[PDB]
Every structure is written in structure tokens, then in C-alpha cells.
Design a protein around this nucleic acid. Structure first.
Ligand SMILES: [Mg+2]
Ligand SMILES: [Mg+2]
Ligand SMILES: [Mg+2]
Ligand SMILES: [Mg+2]
Ligand SMILES: [Mg+2]
Ligand SMILES: [Mg+2]
Ligand SMILES: [Mg+2]
Ligand SMILES: [Mg+2]
Ligand SMILES: [Mg+2]
Ligand SMILES: [Mg+2]
Ligand SMILES: [Mg+2]
Ligand SMILES: [Mg+2]
Ligand SMILES: [Mg+2]
Ligand SMILES: [Mg+2]
Ligand SMILES: [Mg+2]
Ligand SMILES: [Mg+2]
Ligand SMILES: [Mg+2]
Ligand SMILES: [Mg+2]
Ligand SMILES: [Mg+2]
Ligand SMILES: [Mg+2]
Ligand SMILES: [Mg+2]
Ligand SMILES: [Mg+2]
Ligand SMILES: [Mg+2]
Ligand SMILES: [Mg+2]
Ligand SMILES: [Mg+2]
Ligand SMILES: [Mg+2]
Ligand SMILES: [Mg+2]
Ligand SMILES: [Mg+2]
Ligand SMILES: [Mg+2]
Ligand SMILES: [Mg+2]
Ligand SMILES: [Mg+2]
Ligand SMILES: [Mg+2]
Ligand SMILES: [Mg+2]
Ligand SMILES: [Mg+2]
Ligand SMILES: [Mg+2]
Ligand SMILES: [Mg+2]
Ligand SMILES: [Mg+2]
Ligand SMILES: [Mg+2]
Ligand SMILES: [Mg+2]
Ligand SMILES: [Mg+2]
Ligand SMILES: [Mg+2]
Ligand SMILES: [Mg+2]
Ligand SMILES: [Mg+2]
Ligand SMILES: [Mg+2]
Ligand SMILES: [Mg+2]
Ligand SMILES: [Mg+2]
Ligand SMILES: [Mg+2]
Ligand SMILES: [Mg+2]
Ligand SMILES: [Mg+2]
Ligand SMILES: [Mg+2]
Ligand SMILES: [Mg+2]
Ligand SMILES: [Mg+2]
Ligand SMILES: [Mg+2]
Ligand SMILES: [Mg+2]
Ligand SMILES: [Mg+2]
Ligand SMILES: [Mg+2]
Lengths: 144, 116, 203, 63
RNA sequence: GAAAGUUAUAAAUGAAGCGGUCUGGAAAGGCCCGCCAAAGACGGUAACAGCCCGGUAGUUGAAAUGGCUUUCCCUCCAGAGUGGAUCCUGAGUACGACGGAACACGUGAAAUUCCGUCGGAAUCCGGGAGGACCAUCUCCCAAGGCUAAAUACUCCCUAGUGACCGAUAGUGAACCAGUACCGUGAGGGAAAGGUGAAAAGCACCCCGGAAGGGGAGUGAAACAGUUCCUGAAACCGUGUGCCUACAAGUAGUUAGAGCCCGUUAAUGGGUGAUAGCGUGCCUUUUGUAGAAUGAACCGGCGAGUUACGAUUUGUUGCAAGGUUAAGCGGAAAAAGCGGAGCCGUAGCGAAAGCGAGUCUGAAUAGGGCGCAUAAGUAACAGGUCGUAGACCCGAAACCAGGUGAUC
RNA sequence: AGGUUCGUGGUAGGAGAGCGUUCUAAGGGCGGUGAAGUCAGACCGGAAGGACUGGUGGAGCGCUUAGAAGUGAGAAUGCCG
């Protein structure tokens, strides 16, 4: 406790302005001379342009939001290889193992990767390529 | 915690005021005019460390000129002749020699005169 | 390690878990955790009054123009004698806490560091019939301690807290309260066997 | 307090996969007799926000 | 209305050094020896005390009054089932038009709640809602009333705490302070702490009307003498080493005799006849010695901060994962528990949707955004930004409640 | 650690390394045989600054490594004396 030394580069000393001219941040404290931006509390809004019409006011709005929108929890094929062949992969098993904790609106299997095992996979949705890839290794797919 | 400003201001200002000893009136008593006087003295000393060398060279040259005119020469002729003879004695030594040991000065003047 | 008895005589040997008492200590982690635990202790009860909380003010001292004085707006402005303070201290909290795994690594590191410097004593038991500081001081003399000490005990240790209370370098803790700041604050660590078993099984 | 999203910008910008903003063209309402078919074909597509504008509007649509 | 218990409002008891010696005005300090401790909290005592004093841990104590908890007493008490003729289930009410208000919701495609004014239902084969509305379904039963706990705050009382202030600070107020003083009034609103351990607070003599001194005495100290610890600078004086009455000076600096000294001892100190060079500081400016601004002098005080978000850099832990919030637990601890949530691991499209692709398009075309071409997350520190007075000082004005026709 | 080469005027401004002040924690010290403060000196460091010696003073204060800030004044027709 009389020899404490924190890891180097993790702590730096704060900079203080308005403390003499030998530091470089003396009289005007890094602000320059006589403007709106030199005053206390001064400056303009985040997107202000001095009176020219701002960019967002020049382009149109697009679209609408759907209230019945569905989004799925996504599983690709590579992570599905961590299972012993001949098993039955189910949503609950995927929850327990740790591949998925958030079941947004269902489980969808996509076809990015490679499988080298025969499994029966049960899920809410499959892509066409995922179904073909699973069936090409000798497995079966069922829609819950 | 609170830091009250004691004992540092007086120390710094007293050091400045003591650096101004011997100045006229308020300039050795009061901090605000002593500070200005001390800055001015430092600037003057910086410039006069340059002017001192050239003043001494002027003095040496004038003394050598006076010594050489008694030997029927000028400073310019004498310096050119000493260059022609390979003699590398500078102004300081020549003026010292002129004031103190004029016989050796006359010897060197004869050497320069023969070089011409 | 070599076990020993409350009277100081040898009692055999004990093996300590290598996962807890035999790691390579992480010194930077321990320093971070010490600074965190020490910042968490302070209270933060400090305040000043700014120009709106000082009594009085409101009225303009004199007119804006004509009198030959500087323009002023209140008698409680920051450059007036009894006026308000500009920023100053305010009541706040200093406590922060860094993730759980780093804290476990820190306790393991400090405890292994105690083991490496041969500053750890394992003890078979520690009991006293009645509270008696003279007897505890004699016990502390039998084993060569003579300095600040942290005693760590489990249940069935009787009258150890009371007998060690009036001695000033000594602190007794109940084996679930072991912490980095308390270990780093004492030179020697004295542990009973039951307490070291419980410490091993906690982490 | 947490900072507020500019609601007018969130109605007309769109975040792409690399983290930059996609916008719509702004000469597309009501005067279509006065511009050619090439112009109208090219103005019905989308565009990207330039670097100078992104420096200025970055923080007001941060979420 | 009783009894038992407990608690609050006075208190009692309570271990161990007059230890030797040094300095000193005085020992609690230094050196050398002991002892107590469920007591080494705090304060006092002639200097810094566990063992000198008040006390502290532990253990006890209540006539009287208050509170709280139990037990007794006292007081008050119908609740199940099977039926479905007939009866009841909140009326100027619910609703609607018009004008307003509250709902995050500014009249809007505007549900829901309330107010004023008009109109105005059904009643179990009945009525309301599910964000205009209709049908189906689902859930519910308005127009009567009461209800503890978890939540908000502190004028107070008791016990404490602080990387809070230390007399221009901290309350306006450490002192007979909302006082003195100012104003018709409402109202505004100060300055001002310190003898000594102990008054031992100077018997007596001398000058003087006194004040004030000089001795003598007290004290460790009177150069601590009733604005009294210390006692800086401006400012006012007395004495003296060197210079100065023919000289034109931002007052110094460089060169330099003569005179006078003798140091943190080293190519040392004070003063300077004469010679060269030389138009203060700040602010604001294309440009200031400026006849542009500010400062009489000295001292004290006096201006980029904090909270919560965003982004970037550094550091550390874990890593296709990372991390808990509130809360529980505890000592205003440290663990353990808590996975609800949040960010990342997939994108494209206004959307339905499709997915390593997708959108546009009649298109197996071309093109846009993505993948191939995979590292994130939690915490701390630095820079900058946002919301807050937001680096500090400064208007003329605006609004709300009061006080004034003693001029 | 040593070389070689090229450099080292500067306002607004960017970057870096430090000095000093108050407080906290640990270590280790000083001090009535005289602390802080105050006065005076011809000493030390590249700067901010730091010692040593003597007078006054009469009770507390440095150093090291870390941490946190009411953190440094010559100017505001600044406020108070
Ligand atoms: Mg730091
Ligand atoms: Mg810095
Ligand atoms: Mg002088
Ligand atoms: Mg002079
Ligand atoms: Mg020169
Ligand atoms: Mg306050
Ligand atoms: Mg004002
Ligand atoms: Mg006041
Ligand atoms: Mg602060
Ligand atoms: Mg963790
Ligand atoms: Mg004795
Ligand atoms: Mg004596
Ligand atoms: Mg003693
Ligand atoms: Mg105690
Ligand atoms: Mg005490
Ligand atoms: Mg004693
Ligand atoms: Mg009716
Ligand atoms: Mg409806
Ligand atoms: Mg309606
Ligand atoms: Mg609903
Ligand atoms: Mg319902
Ligand atoms: Mg009610
Ligand atoms: Mg505090
Ligand atoms: Mg004072
Ligand atoms: Mg007194
Ligand atoms: Mg006294
Ligand atoms: Mg008389
Ligand atoms: Mg008298
Ligand atoms: Mg004195
Ligand atoms: Mg005195
Ligand atoms: Mg004096
Ligand atoms: Mg004086
Ligand atoms: Mg004289
Ligand atoms: Mg003449
Ligand atoms: Mg001389
Ligand atoms: Mg003369
Ligand atoms: Mg001008
Ligand atoms: Mg002045
Ligand atoms: Mg400040
Ligand atoms: Mg920086
Ligand atoms: Mg009037
Ligand atoms: Mg640095
Ligand atoms: Mg200093
Ligand atoms: Mg100390
Ligand atoms: Mg001093
Ligand atoms: Mg001095
Ligand atoms: Mg001095
Ligand atoms: Mg004295
Ligand atoms: Mg900090
Ligand atoms: Mg501070
Ligand atoms: Mg301050
Ligand atoms: Mg200054
Ligand atoms: Mg002013
Ligand atoms: Mg003034
Ligand atoms: Mg005064
Ligand atoms: Mg004044």
C-alpha cells in the first residue's frame, strides 16, 4: 500500500485551461477571439447551418412501420455441427446449450456453412437451401 | 477540500522585488513596477551580450590604427600585409602588443611592410 | 505447508488448493481493485452555496450608468466578499465496481502473493475458554508474529473476537468476509484449517 | 438525462450494414413536366450522405 | 377495565505505575523497567497519558409518568345445498349534438376520461369494452361507499459519521444578530474570535493636573501589561558607508576608474565620475511609445465544474460471446444470490417477405446496399459534443403578489 | 547505451513532459537540546522552483509511493480592508 503503481497508460492527467500563458491555454483558453463560439454557453444547434435550409429538410420521408412485424432468431449450419449425430435438435435444446437465449418470433435455420452430421432438426422456419443441405447429409426437417 | 492561497504568492513576489535592488524609488519597492523593470533589465542584458564583442573589436581596431600610423602605414595596408605574410594574430593581441610592447609591434609592422 | 498448533508446536502438514493459492498473481488487477474498494468507502458529504442560495441579493446595488462605479448586478456575485461560490464541491458518490471475474482474480492473486512471501500461517484450531486478552497476547507471542495480523476463523472458535479486540494491530474476521483491502492492509495472514477449507470451497 | 433522437431525421434516414446513412433524392414531388426522363429515372433511386454532412449530423441520429 | 413483561425519561459499580532517571517553568516527551485489558472510545490535566481525573468494556438500578407487546376481561356474531313461475340488481343516469379541457396524442381516420348547455336509452330474450365503425368472438357488469403495507418530506429530540469550512471561509449571524444602521412603509441589512498554566493584572519610588513614561516587582516570557499568540507589505521616521549644485534623464543595461567592505569562498559584496546603446505593462488592432483602453499603492478574495447520455483514444478481464439492473444479504462492508433486460453473432426491402443474399425490373441482364474479406463486450482514465445558468461579471426591459396621497 | 545526418524565431492553435499548493492511505521520520509561520544572506537546478545557516516565534510538521481537488492572479471604470 506504500508502493501502489497502476498499469501504465491507463491513467492520464487532466488538462486545465486559463492558468497562465506558459501552458498554451492561457488568456483565451483555446477559444480564439470575439465570436459567438467564444462566449459562455455559446454555439449553435447540432444541425444548424446558419440559415441555409438544413439537409434533412431538403429530402423526403419514406415508408411506414408495420405493427404485426415478425423477426426470427437466426441459426446457421456451422454451429449445428457441435451436436452428436442421430440426435433431435429442438428449440429447447438450442436454448439450453447457449446458441440462443432470445426467441424473438421463432427459430429460423439458414444455410451459411457446412454440416457433416445426420440430425433431425425441428424449427419454426427453414430456408430452402438449409433444408436441402440438412437432407443431403441424411437428416430430416420438421416445421413446428 | 479547500485550498487557500497562502505563502506562495508572497514568496514569488518577494523574489521578484529583491531582484530589483538599487533601482530608483518605487522600482525597488513595489511588485508591479519591479516586475517590469526586471524584465527590461533581462532583455537589455541579452542584447548587450551581443553588442559587447563588436564594441571591443572597434576599440582594438582604433588602437592598432593609431599605432600603425606612427610607422608610416594605415590599418588597411597593415592588415593586408599581415595577411600576405601568413601572420594570424588577431586584433586583441595586436592592440595589447601595441600598448604594452611596441617594439614587437614595430617588428610585425616591418614584416608586413616587407610582405607588400 | 506445515500445520501447527495453538501453542506453536508442529501438527503435521496441509495441502492447499493450487487453483487458489498457487496462481501467478496479477498485480495490475489487484491495484485496480484496491483503488475501487477504497473509493467506495468515502462518504461524499460536502457542499457550498452558489449565488442563488446565499441570503439576500435580488436588488441591483446602483444604476447601470452615471455614478462612475463599475457595473454591478447583485451583492452576492462571486467577486463580492460574502458572495456565492462559482462551482465548488457538491454532494455525490464515488463508489464504482468492476466486473465479477476480475474481482475473483484479484482475491486469488493477493492470497497467492501472501503464500509466496511465506507470510501465511495455517493453524489447527483457535479457542479460548473465556475472553482473556492476556492469553491471546501470549498465543500471539508463541508463534512469531509481533506485527499486524489478520486472523481468519470459522465456527466453533470461541471467544477469539473478544480476546483480540483491544490489541491494535490485530483483526479477526469470520472467513466469509475476506477481502482484498483487508488482506493488503495487514502484514501476516493467520488461517484456521476449517476456515481455509471454506475459503477453498467458496472460490 | 439521456440524449434525444432527432425525430425528423429518423423519419428519412436509414442505417446501412457498414454503419453509414442512406437517403432519398429531393427533387421528386410536383414539377415533372420541367425535367427530362433521364433526370426522373435517376432521381427515383437512393443515395448516400456525404462526408461533410455526416460530420455535422452524426450525433443527432446516434440511435 | 385489569395483570405480566419490555422500553424511555435521574443514576450505581467498575482493572492496572505517586516506577527510576534526563531536559525543562511545568513531563503525558527521551532512555531503562513493570502491569491491566470483554476496558488502547473521547475529553481534561503546566508539553504528546490504557495504568492522574471524568470516564470506557462488562454488570446493575426506578418511587413516578409515558409508550409498546401478550393474557384476561369486555363486546358482537347464522352458513351450507337443491330449484328456476314471478320479482330485484344504482335515470334526467349512460349516451348524442354544440363549445372547451385532460389523455405522450396540437381535431386528426380519434377510441378513452371530465366540465357547461340542450336533447335523451335499455333493463338478463339486458348492458359495456377490445383506439372511427359494422359482424363474429373474447373479456367484463357503470351511473353508491370504506380500506393497512410497500411511497414523499424534516421545524424538531436522541446517538453518531465525513480524503466538509476554519473567522474576507463556514449560516446573514462562532462575539447580547435579524441586532446597529437606512427607509413613511412593505422592505434592505453590517462590522466585530485568541493575555497568561495560573491574575500571580505591576506594592513601593521618581517626572507629570492627568494621560504617558523610567525604575522596582510577578512570570518561563512584560519586545505576554486588560484590540494582550504570531506580526508580512504599502506607508511614516532616526542614524549612517558611497555619489550628487554646467546638467536635457521610460531611469536600466554594457564598458569603467575612484572610494568603502569582507561571503553559503568565488574568475566575491556596496556605491558609482565618465562613455556606448535604449520610446512602461495590458487589451484591442492592417498598424499602438501611443495624444486609443485599464490600473493611486499594498494585501486578501475573484473565472471550463458536476450529474446523466453520445463518440473516439488508451488500459485491464473474458471472448462468439460479454455483462447484470432493481432487489435479497450484510457493518453507510466484502462475497454469494438475482439472466428480467442490453449490446454482439446477418443482411436486404416502404412492406408482405426472402436470406449469404436481397431490392428494382418481364429479365438466368445490369446496377444499389451487404457476404466472401468474422470480434465483440464490461469497467476505469484522457479529449470533444448534448441536456442542465454550463468559463466569469454586466443591461435596458417583461410578468406575479404586496406597500405607499405625512411630498 | 553509443553513433551519423538533418534541425531548434514565432501570434491564434494542436501535441508532450513537468513544478508547486490543500487533503487521504500505507511506509519511514523530525520536533521544547525548539514545529509551522516570519526576517536576512555572496548556495543549488534548464524553467516552474529547492536547500543550508542565523534572528524572531512558542507547538506541531516534513519525506516516499499512490489517490482526490474550492489548484497557481497584475489588469475585470472587479469586492473588502
Ligand atoms: Mg490518477
Ligand atoms: Mg498536463
Ligand atoms: Mg533594497
Ligand atoms: Mg545604483
Ligand atoms: Mg556580436
Ligand atoms: Mg452549503
Ligand atoms: Mg444579475
Ligand atoms: Mg454578509
Ligand atoms: Mg469540483
Ligand atoms: Mg464478470
Ligand atoms: Mg515519578
Ligand atoms: Mg529545570
Ligand atoms: Mg514519562
Ligand atoms: Mg473502545
Ligand atoms: Mg485521549
Ligand atoms: Mg500511568
Ligand atoms: Mg329506469
Ligand atoms: Mg368504443
Ligand atoms: Mg364519442
Ligand atoms: Mg388493449
Ligand atoms: Mg373486460
Ligand atoms: Mg378511498
Ligand atoms: Mg466528506
Ligand atoms: Mg486571522
Ligand atoms: Mg486566554
Ligand atoms: Mg491561556
Ligand atoms: Mg505632579
Ligand atoms: Mg502611572
Ligand atoms: Mg515577539
Ligand atoms: Mg508573546
Ligand atoms: Mg513591526
Ligand atoms: Mg514592517
Ligand atoms: Mg546617507
Ligand atoms: Mg557652458
Ligand atoms: Mg568598483
Ligand atoms: Mg570624481
Ligand atoms: Mg480601433
Ligand atoms: Mg494596485
Ligand atoms: Mg475555480
Ligand atoms: Mg489531449
Ligand atoms: Mg411611495
Ligand atoms: Mg506529464
Ligand atoms: Mg512553494
Ligand atoms: Mg506521520
Ligand atoms: Mg518566510
Ligand atoms: Mg524571507
Ligand atoms: Mg531574503
Ligand atoms: Mg522566544
Ligand atoms: Mg479524477
Ligand atoms: Mg481543491
Ligand atoms: Mg478556494
Ligand atoms: Mg499574472
Ligand atoms: Mg466588474
Ligand atoms: Mg476596485
Ligand atoms: Mg481592518
Ligand atoms: Mg478600497
Amino acid at each position: 500500500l506504500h508502493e501502489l503503481k497502476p498499469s501504465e497508460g491507463s491513467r492520464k492527467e487532466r488538462n486545465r485551461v486559463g492558468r497562465g500563458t506558459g501552458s498554451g491555454n492561457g488568456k483565451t483558453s483555446g477559444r480564439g477571439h470575439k465570436g459567438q463560439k467564444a462566449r459562455s454557453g455559446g454555439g449553435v444547434r447540432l444541425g444548424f447551418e446558419g440559415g441555409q435550409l438544413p439537409l434533412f429538410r431538403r429530402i423526403p420521408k419514406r415508408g411506414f412501420t408495420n405493427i404485426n412485424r415478425k423477426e426470427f432468431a437466426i441459426v446457421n449450419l456451422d454451429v449445428l455441427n457441435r451436436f452428436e449425430d442421430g440426435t433431435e435438435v429442438t428449440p429447447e435444446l438450442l436454448i439450453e446449450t447457449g446458441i440462443i437465449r432470445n426467441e424473438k418470433s421463432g427459430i429460423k435455420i439458414l444455410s451459411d456453412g457446412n454440416i457433416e452430421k445426420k440430425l433431425t432438426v425441428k424449427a419454426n422456419k427453414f430456408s430452402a437451401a438449409a433444408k436441402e443441405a440438412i437432407e443431403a447429409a441424411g437428416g430430416k426437417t420438421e416445421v413446428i | 477540500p479547500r485550498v487557500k492561497g497562502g505563502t506562495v504568492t508572497r514568496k514569488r513576489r518577494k523574489k521578484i522585488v529583491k531582484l530589483a535592488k538599487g533601482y530608483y524609488g518605487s522600482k525597488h519597492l513595489l511588485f508591479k513596477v519591479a516586475n517590469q523593470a526586471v524584465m527590461k533589465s533581462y532583455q537589455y542584458a541579452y542584447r548587450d551580450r551581443r553588442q559587447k564583442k563588436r564594441d571591443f573589436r572597434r576599440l582594438w581596431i582604433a588602437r592598432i590604427n593609431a599605432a600603425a600610423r606612427m610607422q608610416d602605414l594605415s590599418y588597411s595596408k597593415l592588415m593586408h600585409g599581415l595577411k600576405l605574410a601568413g601572420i594570424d594574430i588577431n586584433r586583441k593581441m595586436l592592440a595589447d602588443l601595441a600598448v604594452n610592447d611596441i617594439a614587437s609591434f614595430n617588428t610585425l609592422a616591418d614584416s608586413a611592410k616587407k610582405a607588400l | 505447508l506445515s500445520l501447527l498448533k495453538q501453542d506453536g508446536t508442529n501438527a503435521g502438514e496441509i495441502t492447499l488448493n493450487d487453483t487458489v493459492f498457487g496462481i501467478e498473481p496479477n498485480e495490475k488487477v489487484v491495484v485496480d481493485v484496491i483503488l475501487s474498494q477504497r473509493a467506495s468507502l468515502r462518504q461524499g458529504t460536502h457542499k457550498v452555496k452558489n449565488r442563488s442560495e446565499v441570503r439576500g441579493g435580488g436588488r441591483k446595488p446602483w444604476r447601470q450608468k452615471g455614478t462612475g462605479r463599475a457595473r454591478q448586478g447583485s451583492i452576492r456575485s462571486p467577486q463580492w466578499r460574502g458572495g456565492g461560490v462559482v462551482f465548488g464541491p457538491t454532494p455525490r458518490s464515488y463508489a464504482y465496481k468492476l466486473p465479477k471475474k476480475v474481482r475473483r482474480l484479484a482475491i486469488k492473486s493477493i492470497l497467492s502473493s501472501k503464500v509466496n512471501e511465506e507470510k501465511l500461517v495455517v493453524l489447527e484450531g483457535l479457542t479460548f475458554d473465556a475472553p482473556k486478552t492476556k492469553e491471546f497476547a501470549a498465543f500471539l507471542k508463541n508463534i512469531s508474529v509481533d506485527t499486524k495480523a489478520l486472523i481468519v476463523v470459522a465456527g466453533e472458535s470461541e471467544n477469539v473476537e473478544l480476546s483480540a479486540r483491544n490489541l491494535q494491530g490485530i483483526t479477526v474476521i469470520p472467513a466469509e468476509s475476506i477481502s482484498v483491502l483487508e488482506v493488503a492492509k495487514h502484514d501476516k495472514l493467520i488461517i484456521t484449517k476449517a476456515a481455509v477449507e471454506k475459503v477453498e470451497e467458496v472460490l | 438525462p439521456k440524449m434525444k433522437t432527432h425525430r425528423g431525421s429518423a423519419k428519412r434516414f436509414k442505417r446501412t450494414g457498414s454503419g453509414k446513412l442512406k437517403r432519398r433524392h429531393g427533387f421528386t414531388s410536383h414539377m415533372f413536366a420541367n425535367k427530362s426522363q433521364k433526370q426522373k429515372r435517376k432521381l427515383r433511386k437512393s443515395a448516400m450522405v456525404s462526408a461533410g454532412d455526416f460530420k455535422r449530423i452524426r450525433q443527432m441520429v446516434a440511435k
